[PDB]
Structures are given as C-alpha cells and as structure tokens.
Amino acid sequence: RWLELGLTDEEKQNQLEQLAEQYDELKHEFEKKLEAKRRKITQGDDLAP
Amino acid sequence: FFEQGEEYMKPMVLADIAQAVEMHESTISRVTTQKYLHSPRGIFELKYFFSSHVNTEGGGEA
Numbered sequence: 625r626w627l628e629l630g631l632t633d634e635e636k637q638n639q640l641e642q643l644a645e646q647y648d649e650l651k652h653e654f655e656k657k658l659e660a661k662r663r664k665i666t667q668g669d670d671l672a673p
Numbered sequence: 674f675f676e677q678g679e680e681y682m683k684p685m686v687l688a689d690i691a692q693a694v695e696m697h698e699s700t701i702s703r704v705t706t707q708k709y710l711h712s713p714r715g716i717f718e719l720k721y722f723f724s725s726h727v728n729t730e731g732g733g734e735a
Contacts, residue, residue, distance in 0.1 A: 670713055 674722075675712055684726035684734050 625631075628640035674682045691698045705719040726734040 673711055673716060 675714055678714075682722075682724075685723050687723065 625640055625643075628636040631640075687698045687701055690696065690701055705723070708719040710717055710719060729735040
C-alpha cells in the first residue's frame with residue numbers, strides 16, 4: 625500500500641503498521657507450522673533391535 | 674550422541690568419568706569391559722564411547 629505515503633497521514637500510517645505486523649505474525653505462524661509438520665513427518669519410527 | 678549421531682560425539686576418558694562421581698580409574702576400567710547398551714540408535718559396547726581427542730579451533734577438543 626505504498627507504505628501509506630500520503631493516504632491520510634493521521635491514521636493510515638498506524639493502519640499500515642498494524643497490517644504489516646499482522647502479516648509478519650501470519651508469516652511467522654506459517655513458517656513455524658510448516659517446520660513442525662516437516663519435523664513430525666520425518667521424525668522417525670522405532671523398530672526392532 | 675544419542676540425539677544427533679556419531680558425528681556429534683564428545684570425547685571422554687576414564688579419568689573424566691572417575692572424577693565425575695567419587696570414583697577411581699581402575700574401578701571403572703573393569704566395569705565397562707564387555708558391557709552392552711541398547712538405544713534406539715543401536716547396540717553398542719561401553720568401551721566404544723571412550724576415545725582419543727584432537728586439538729580443534731578455539732582451544733576445543735574433537
């Protein structure tokens with residue numbers, strides 16, 4: 625959103641900051657979920673001695 | 674070692690194990706002879722864990 629250059633200059637900046645924070649949080653959650661899923665898929669199975 | 678593998682083993686000596694818990698070298702030397710341990714990694718003798726070290730970067734031992 626052009627980093628909210630000249631939309632409103634009063635609340636558009638805070639709105640863009642909150643939106644970027646939410647996007648970063650969603651990206652972090654997605655990365656963590658993918659990492660956990662990949663770790664659980666190839667975690668390994670116990671076999672006979 | 675049990676987590677990561679043979680690639681991640683730290684060196685250990687009889688003298689280090691004796692110093693751990695009120696023990697002597699001679700005594701542990703006899704216990705660990707022909708003794709086996711089963712872990713999900715594999716089946717191994719206790720004598721297998723003990724090995725020599727080489728000088729590494731940063732003063733460490735490999």
